[PDB]
Design a binder for this molecule. Structure first.
Ligand SMILES: [Cl-]
Ligand SMILES: [Cl-]
Ligand SMILES: [Zn+2]
Ligand SMILES: [Zn+2]
Lengths: 123, 125
DNA sequence: ACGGGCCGCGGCCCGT
DNA sequence: ACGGGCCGCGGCCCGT
């Protein structure tokens, strides 16, 4: 589990602190512990820079839709996209790919946080 | 809404066991849980206000995984917190024995815990 | 195996 | 909708 967190940490971008990244990754890995296929799809997607199409990586949607990490609240798909792909990401600059089944905009009970299931768009 | 008068009257019957702020936080927490349980809330007001003059109904809250309740950053058993508040300000661990009348006593290991202080009696054991 | 810590996050309510 | 601080249950680790 620690080797998984460490391997995902190696692919973070300089958007936030090392400590924020660690807490965000630990939180996500713990939720995917009982979902082997989703965890494997996350490791493969991050490690290979989304080289091949990956499966949805989902977490339970909160009542307000935001996730809190180290005292900061934000949309979960935005947090993980900022962390591994766009460190300067803000507002509504994300558009989900047609392949993504559990995209944040699709208003499902489960939210896809796979950063390679979203693409950056102009404001 | 209309909770403020209920919290205030229960506050009037607290004992000098803890701070005024701790007592309000504990009472507000309990009143909010009993908002949808009219009979249990009325039994709590009647029991506290009359110093347990007549037999009252069980006043229950949902049991937590660990069995303890947190109030203003401090953890403790819920039946102990409310018994210390309204009856025994100097109350310690293993000093409470539930009355035969009490259906949801902490020791009975139910999904619901009775926090009515007049449903427990102080012992030496 | 308790208690007694604090410690992060969801649910919560209140401010530009 | 935001961006906080808010408190508490659910976690965890520490001294007995
Ligand atoms: Cl989207
Ligand atoms: Cl008991
Ligand atoms: Zn997806
Ligand atoms: Zn009872």
């Amino acid at each position: 589990c620690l080797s998984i967190v460490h391997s995902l940490m190696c692919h973070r971008q300089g958007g936030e602190s090392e400590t924020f990244a660690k807490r965000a990754i630990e939180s996500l890995v713990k939720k995917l512990k009982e979902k082997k296929d989703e965890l494997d799809s996350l490791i493969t997607a991050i490690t290979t820079n989304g080289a091949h199409p990956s499966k949805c990586v989902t977490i339970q949607r909160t009542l307000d839709g935001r996730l809190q990490v180290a005292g900061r609240k934000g949309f979960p798909h935005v947090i993980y996209a900022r962390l591994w792909r766009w460190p300067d990401l803000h507002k509504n600059e994300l558009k989900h790919v047609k392949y993504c089944q559990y995209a944040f905009d699709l208003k499902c009970d489960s939210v896809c946080v796979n950063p390679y299931h979203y693409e950056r768009v102009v404001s």
